[PDB]
Symmetry: D2
Subunit: 310 residues, 4 copies
């Protein structure tokens, strides 16, 4: 999967993700109101007046298990597969704010209003894992974004300058790998000469030659970091939703491109987004590219029950 | 730009093109009914009962200039930019069928029912470049296909080239011979999960799916777009339903779409996939979405009185 | 194999080739004097006073079969494998200068003093093939170089602006393939930014990223065209011999890199060169990188017998 | 720069490095006999009967600053540039063995006989960066190996890292953890002849050898040089004679050599493989050639009175 974040001219948030897998987990748009009472698994704190949050989630037991969610104040968080590198403790620790892995997205969206508050609180947080989900998290608002990678050596809180996250390996690898492609440009290739041979481009795109096209995790990071960094800034909601869905489409997994270990094909089953300017969640699926919208002002946020719209 | 053709299990035609450019020409879904009277520019011969055609294009001097179109029998054609290689005569040749460049997509759709019928007639055809008064010279090559196979028509300075398109895909420059020799570089890429191996004492494994596909280029240049979409079209598992096949078409073309900001033209503007059009012969329907809207709109041959006498242009 | 040509500041010739194969053909430095009488196979013409030539060759029958040779006036020619694309006629044609394939290198070096005379004469030449060797030829002097590709559609005489030749496919492919790499530079990578991320190079070489490193024929052409076009010009014999052998070493085939269809490994068995400034032939082998020299002024050129020095 | 290590069937050591730079430092083959008295800078402990060592370096204050060296027991070490990642303390740490950076190659060669002996002692070692008065701070990592295995010693801001080098090769930046994760991208490249396959209806074949190796990078950047030389060292068939093994060393290092004009430094000059040095433990001989001369010169331990008391520097 792929995580993308950017902003417009007014500091608004635009946040989105792809979900690449073989089978659907019954994903549905889940709205968690503020009047909904949540009992944290390991006795973690939170805001007195919680924030209304929205996203894509299943409803296991009686708890919202968000794949990706955002709150009414512009903060968003998504989780991505990190197996072979993620490593959690299975027992709580006294003296720290203990949050379970599955509740971590719902936790940060309910209580925090900016990425700065998240990076501040994470210094006293233990991620407890009760097959288990081995994930890292992509968190961002209208200003910047951070990556949370919990490994066997501790918790790493990377500042994400390319506003882009992908699966394995570690974030330090992807950032070092980007330096291999620093000369790739979006300018039209300048006519040059190799001895007496004059070389010209057939058209646009030759200056971008070098970017990989495979759907592997390190190569998807490079391709979507390039697209996000070079996409011109927009100043209205319609264009920025198009920008987010087009930027994510550049690393989509088309049926037939690569199998798993189970033998099935990795496919971008759905693509979710979020805009803080309108407080709306967007989503389309592999079988329907139409972009459906789910606004926050269309649900009773002071209600007390999770609503799972189909 | 990219043209794509494949088929389901019943032999129907699934055909689609990406239009990459920096500005629009006012294109629209164009209906050319059977009762419309077309007076060819250079006297080219036509069918007795002409085929009803559907596609995307503009109208000029009451003549449909199709960017791409298809008829009621599952035959489709699209024109893709080919400058610096395409070369046409500007005079008709007596003794052969003389079809102008702009009328070529219309001409093959009205009077032919299969690629075999098409490929035979090109043996006695001369594309004549007639400069449209207010426009520029269109130096294009064409991508024709049906529910069985596809061909490429490249008319260069050394005559006409008609290639059997085995990979069922076409892009821009250079010649089709280059693209197929270029594919031999990426013959080793595989959609199989990467097999764990070892380099001396180091044991290498894959983080996940896609490592075996490493090597496929990811830039939006014409040759790289060719390699990538040829891999995507060849490895997509065959579908059996119409909704699944329409999904395969717009997703295969999405693998080589041009996102705003990716690459500038020679004039300072960005090349974007302005629209994506498609056709299905199982239902005789044209599909189209734009850069501003991924909703796949549908236009069926049955929703238009195809025995009318005038061009129907729907927005 | 690879063919390389360049010149110094005084129009002198520097010409060289690698020979990539599994087994040695008994290659030896062969000197063909001018007093040596040669009987052309199909009755082809030639100069009255022949040119003394030198190169690497075997002595089948009583004819010098040169892999690569040069004459005393600065012209050089080498042959490279072109199977699956080379196609010759097997019967002579009346009215044309008929030269057999194996005699073609010895033919052009004996009679011609410049590349211009070669391109002029080739308009009335038929290459006759009497397993057969399917080759194309790399011919050059101190000014330019040409490629001679005899295919089933006729003879093509390409002007070689990159002064570089490699095996399959056709020359028109390699020249079109070079346009994919026109943005690769030898400048130190300029620090750039992808959003808020500042990208710098670890050191020199990042600007050259994009050039392939495999030893396949199309990729070797690209790598050696880059090296030859960017190698700074030299103004003395010692440096230009180093330039030619280093430029050719950039595409050498090291044991273990790639097998053949027979199962054996392709290895650069030897590397031959030639300088017209000194009229000397240079050569080293895979088992000895020492550069041995064989001057023209050390052999009796007015003699009448081929001397094959070991 | 690149360091390479492999072995024959008898377990001897074959070790070599490429020195890529734009200017020379006056290096030369340096003899440090057993009778030479070295007063370590920070009181590091040494062997009772020290090993006679051979290598390439300079002399400063009557102390051999080895670029790379090896002893009479088949243990070799080389220092490669590692700026922006290497970080050293500038004060000795009481309770541990304190070895200066410039004396590190000398120190491990005089007092150790195997990589196992080495790797154990690093547990109680502190490399201290002492700025040479007239020179700059050397931020290096080291490549140590014998006739069995090799290790990498990277001393960064977060402590010492000692990696088991399974691919038996080392380049410059970045950290060794990056290079080994980077190798997983090229796990699919193969030295086998490419297997004919088909993409839909198109049948792809290889023009010849090397197509299965497609994907290996060819630029002279530090990561790409790592991938390429790791493939060359891992796939070279094992040799049994000394002449064949010396040929393998200088040819494996030739696969990543830097030719004049390929890449400019940050100061405007070209990086060239100034020299290439090597060592063989089957004969206890050092080998070296330069950019101006590919003739492999030999310098054997037996050709020098190794019981002398002074440094022997041969041009
Ligand atoms: C994007 C990527 O590569 C990983 C996608 C799949 C495997 C992930 C994405 C979100 C995951 C959910 C999150 C909610 C719960 C959390 C529980 O701890 C485990 C079950 C759960 C449904 C996760 C399963 C994997 C998941 C779908
Ligand atoms: C997708 C791609 O490669 C870019 C090609 C564009 C610019 C081409 C493709 C179809 C062209 C039309 C065809 C109809 C008429 C023909 C006239 O001769 C010129 C005007 C015309 C509208 C063409 C303009 C360029 C065009 C859209
Ligand atoms: C460089 C490359 O890829 C091809 C190398 C080998 C296969 C070529 C190079 C020169 C060839 C000689 C040339 C002399 C005669 C010519 C006869 O027509 C056939 C035999 C001959 C020895 C050639 C064999 C192939 C050859 C070594
Ligand atoms: C090959 C490569 O990566 C480039 C590294 C070069 C510039 C390094 C490698 C060895 C270095 C020597 C080591 C001995 C002394 C140490 C002193 O602290 C500084 C001077 C010295 C000669 C180093 C200079 C840089 C050097 C050649």
């Amino acid at each position: 999967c792929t995580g993308v974040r950017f902003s417009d001219d007014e500091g608004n948030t635009y946040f989105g993700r792809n979900l690449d897998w073989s089978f659907s987990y019954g994903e549905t748009i889940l709205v968690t109101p503020r009047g909904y009472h949540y009992d944290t698994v390991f006795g973690a704190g939170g805001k007195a007046k919680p924030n209304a949050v929205i996203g894509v989630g299943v409803v296991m037991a009686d708890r919202p298990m968000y794949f990706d969610c955002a709150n009414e104040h512009g903060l968003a968080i998504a989780g991505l597969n990190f197996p072979g590198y993620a490593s959690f403790v299975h027992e709580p620790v006294e003296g720290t704010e203990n949050v379970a892995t599955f509740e971590f997205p719902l936790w940060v969206a309910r209580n925090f209003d900016s990425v700065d508050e998240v990076e501040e609180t994470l210094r006293n947080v233990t991620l407890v894992s009760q097959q288990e989900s081995l994930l890292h998290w992509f968190i961002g608002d209208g200003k910047r974004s951070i990556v949370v990678e919990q490994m066997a050596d501790g918790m790493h809180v990377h500042h994400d300058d390319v506003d882009v996250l992908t699966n394995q390996p570690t974030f330090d690898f992807h950032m070092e790998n980007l330096r291999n492609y620093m000369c790739v440009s979006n300018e039209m290739a300048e006519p040059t000469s190799w001895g007496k041979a004059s070389l010209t481009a057939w058209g646009a795109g030759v200056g971008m030659h070098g970017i990989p096209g495979d759907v592997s995790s390190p190569s998807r990071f490079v391709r979507v970091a390039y697209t996000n960094a070079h996409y011109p800034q927009q100043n209205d909601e319609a264009a920025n939703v198009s920008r987010l869905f087009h930027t994510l489409g550049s690393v989509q997994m088309v049926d037939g491109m690569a199998k798993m270990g189970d033998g099935q094909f990795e496919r971008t089953l759905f693509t979710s987004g979020y805009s803080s300017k309108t407080n709306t969640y967007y989503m389309n699926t592999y079988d329907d590219p139409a972009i459906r919208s789910y606004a926050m002002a269309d649900y009773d946020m002071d209600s007390s029950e999770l609503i799972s719209v189909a």
